[PDB]
Antibody, heavy 209, light 214 residues
Framework: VQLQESGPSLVKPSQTLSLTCSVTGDSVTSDYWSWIRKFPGNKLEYMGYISYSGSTYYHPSLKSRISITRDTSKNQYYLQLNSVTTEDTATYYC???????WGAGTTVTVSSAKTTAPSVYPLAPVCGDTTGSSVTLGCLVKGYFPEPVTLTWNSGSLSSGVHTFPAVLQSDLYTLSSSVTVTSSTWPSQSITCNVAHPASSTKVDKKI | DIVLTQSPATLSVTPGDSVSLSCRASQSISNNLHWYQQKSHESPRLLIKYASQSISGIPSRFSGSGSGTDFTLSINSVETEDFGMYFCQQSNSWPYTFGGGTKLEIKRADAAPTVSIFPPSSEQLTSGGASVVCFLNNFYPKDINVKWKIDGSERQNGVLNSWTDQDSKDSTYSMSSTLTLTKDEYERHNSYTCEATHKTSTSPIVKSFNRNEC
């Protein structure tokens, strides 16, 4: 048995979120199936399930906003959730009612933001924290959408001592930062550049610290 | 709805140790409890059927027990592959519900964080923004408190934090704290401070700077 979700990874507030679960190695008829979503902070929610015949049960917190259907022919079942809000942003999974088999899961983001290239800012030391054996530099990636961005240092030749943090939602836009630490005597003598690629906006920027 | 309380929040162990995770139900749920494991960017994997029934393909080190309100998941000899999230699931009442989850992490020597503070860049300032960034790197445990002070007064508004996953190498954690102000507000204060408190010491690590000067 093999499951796989599919559908848009980005939906606008008030619109309808739709997803498909393609079943393999079995028929949706010979078993019961469900939809599970994971909210940020590791919060799992059992959305509902459909029987071997087609009967359905939904989670009351989803109050008729939700709809689960199926197509024995194509051997797939579906999920529809109307008038979503940002609070519906999450990783969605389809798995056998028993939790026996699962799909890799798929992320769906609810936001009305438009594609936006990030602002990249060089984070250089305060002229007073340059007296240790090591020194850390930084890079602030601010105001982009949607995720993700790919950040490297010196086009990837610099990787040890690097901490690139998960992005967070600032003003309906994403912000992320990264630090790099090298032996103090090598900077600024041996230059360090922050490289940020944002595929969605077909952009890439390099800021030499 | 049935509230499932899993405890502890996070369990720090060393490979080989025998550990157990607790899950308390808000209502009596008989033996309608199941256990799942979820590793980084991976989907939930079933471990135990109905409180203690075994699942084919699941290593024998895993076992479950309990009924009524208290349930327990046990792992005889923890393996490096076992670190991740563990959730219990109520299928007794509707809607089905999951516990808050317990994070099984690898224990390591406590490590003090290396702290650095960075003033807004000229480019951002030109754009009317002023983000003051603070990096607290390679520390353990993850529990840490960071406070921001503007001219000696603690500032809570405008702060956004972000933590990395436990490093798959040195088992440490790192964190980023950013205080975002407008240039207007940033230029009306003098000293900015990033103060971190970690169990490794009762003395706070303090990093600061004073505007324009240095």
């Amino acid at each position: 048995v093999q499951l796989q979700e599919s559908g848009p990874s980005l939906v606008k507030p008030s619109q309808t979120l739709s997803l498909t679960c393609s079943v393999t190695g079995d028929s949706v008829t010979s078993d019961y199936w469900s939809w599970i979503r994971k909210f940020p902070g590791n919060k799992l929610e059992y959305m509902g399930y459909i029987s071997y015949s087609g009967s359905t049960y939904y989670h009351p917190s989803l109050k008729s906003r939700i709809s689960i259907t199926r197509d024995t022919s194509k051997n797939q079942y579906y999920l529809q959730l109307n008038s979503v809000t940002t609070e519906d942003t999450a990783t969605y999974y389809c798995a056998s009612w028993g939790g026996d088999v699962w799909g890799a899961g798929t992320t769906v983001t609810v936001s009305s933001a438009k594609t936006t290239a990030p602002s990249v800012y060089p984070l250089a030391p305060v002229c007073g924290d340059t007296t240790g054996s090591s020194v850390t530099l930084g890079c602030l990636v601010k105001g982009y959408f949607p995720e993700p961005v790919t950040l490297t240092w010196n086009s990837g030749s610099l990787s040890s001592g690097v901490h690139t943090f998960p992005a967070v939602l600032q003003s309906d836009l994403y912000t992320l930062s990264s630090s790099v630490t090298v032996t103090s005597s090598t900077w600024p003598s041996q230059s360090i550049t922050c490289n940020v690629a944002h595929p969605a906006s077909s952009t890439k920027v390099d800021k030499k610290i | 709805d049935i509230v499932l309380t899993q405890s502890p929040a996070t369990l720090s162990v060393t490979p080989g140790d025998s550990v157990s995770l607790s899950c308390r139900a808000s209502q009596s749920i008989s033996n309608n409890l199941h256990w799942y494991q979820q590793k980084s960017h991976e989907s939930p994997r079933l471990l135990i059927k109905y409180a203690s029934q075994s699942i084919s393909g699941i290593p024998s080190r895993f076992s479950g027990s309990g009924s009524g309100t208290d349930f327990t998941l046990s792992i005889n000899s923890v393996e490096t592959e076992d670190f991740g999230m563990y959730f219990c699931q109520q299928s007794n009442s509707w809607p089905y519900t999951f516990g808050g989850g317990t994070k099984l992490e690898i224990k390591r020597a406590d490590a003090a964080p290396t702290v650095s503070i960075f003033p807004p860049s000229s480019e951002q300032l030109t754009s009317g923004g002023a983000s003051v960034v603070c990096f607290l790197n390679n520390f353990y445990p993850k529990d840490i408190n960071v406070k921001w002070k503007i001219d000696g007064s603690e500032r809570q508004n405008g702060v956004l934090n972000s933590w990395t996953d436990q490093d798959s190498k040195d088992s440490t954690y790192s964190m980023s704290s950013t205080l975002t102000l407008t240039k207007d507000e940033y230029e009306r204060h003098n000293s900015y401070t990033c103060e971190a408190t970690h169990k490794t010491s009762t003395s706070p690590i303090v990093k600061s700077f004073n505007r324009n000067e240095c």
